[PDB]
Amino acid sequence: PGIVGIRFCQECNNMLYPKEDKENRILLYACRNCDYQQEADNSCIYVNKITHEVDELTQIIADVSQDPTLPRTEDHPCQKCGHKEAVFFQSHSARAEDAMRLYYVCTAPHCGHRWTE
Amino acid sequence: RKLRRQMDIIVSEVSMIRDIREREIRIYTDAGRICRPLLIVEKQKLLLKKRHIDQLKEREYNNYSWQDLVASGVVEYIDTLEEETVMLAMTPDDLQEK
Numbered sequence: 001p002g003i004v005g006i007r008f009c010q011e012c013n014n015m016l017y018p019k020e021d022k023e024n025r026i027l028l029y030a031c032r033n034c035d036y037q038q039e040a041d042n043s044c045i046y047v048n049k050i051t052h053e054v055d056e057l058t059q060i061i062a063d064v065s066q067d068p069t070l071p072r073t074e075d076h077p078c079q080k081c082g083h084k085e086a087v088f089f090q091s092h093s094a095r096a097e098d099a100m101r102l103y104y105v106c107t108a109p110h111c112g113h114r115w116t117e
Numbered sequence: 118r119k120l121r122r123q124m125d126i127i128v129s130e131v132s133m134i135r136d137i138r139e140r141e142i143r144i145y146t147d148a149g150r151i152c153r154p155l156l157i158v159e160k161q162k163l164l165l166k167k168r169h170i171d172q173l174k175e176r177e178y179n180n181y182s183w184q185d186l187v188a189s190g191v192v193e194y195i196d197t198l199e200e201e202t203v204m205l206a207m208t209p210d211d212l213q214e215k
């Protein structure tokens with residue numbers, strides 16, 4: 001489905017707003033401070049995830065691997081480069097529903113690969 | 118951290134905090150913060166050696182004291198909100214391989 005996103009006008013750089021073309025039945029975006037119009041490519045407008053199953057692998061930063069206060073195991077090798085050190089931690093996120101799942105971040109410089117088991 | 122342990126540009130009182138997950142870095146020179154000294158650990162060894170303790174043992178008439186201990190980078194003042202980024206060992210015992 002997609003979580004969609006904003007679009008900005010190209011003249012006054014304001015927020016475009018979705019509106020309906022009544023003649024051609026084509027979704028348009030129009031700034032309200034000028035006459036600028038643009039055709040909607042995505043065709044979805046407002047999308048809301050209530051169940052909100054969230055992918056934490058997107059939020060996790062690779063720099064986390066430098067923290068002394070996080071644990072690490074040589075049990076789980078890196079999936080990409082096959083490095084033994086992995087520094088694992090939990091959600092660290094409020095409103096996570098119920099997750100004790102560990103997320104893994106590969107140590108060694110610049111790898112930064114982030115997986116979940 | 119290296120300039121604070123030599124006390125060149127930065128008084129030992131300034132505290133500095135690298136928060137990784139939110140990407141901030143904070144440097145507080147402000148007055149009122151509360152900080153207590155700690156030994157420093159580089160790799161698995163304390164930076165307090167025996168030669169430091171022999172000089173303090175004789176501290177009388179050496180003109181060699183705490184400030185000369187802090188100025189060698191062996192001890193460090195660490196306030197609270199910088200204790201969130203630190204790993205402390207209770208005693209040198211925890212440093213040895215268990």
Ligand SMILES: [Zn+2]
Nearest residue numbers: 009012031034
């Ligand atoms: Zn506009």
Ligand SMILES: [Zn+2]
Nearest residue numbers: 078081106111
């Ligand atoms: Zn790796």
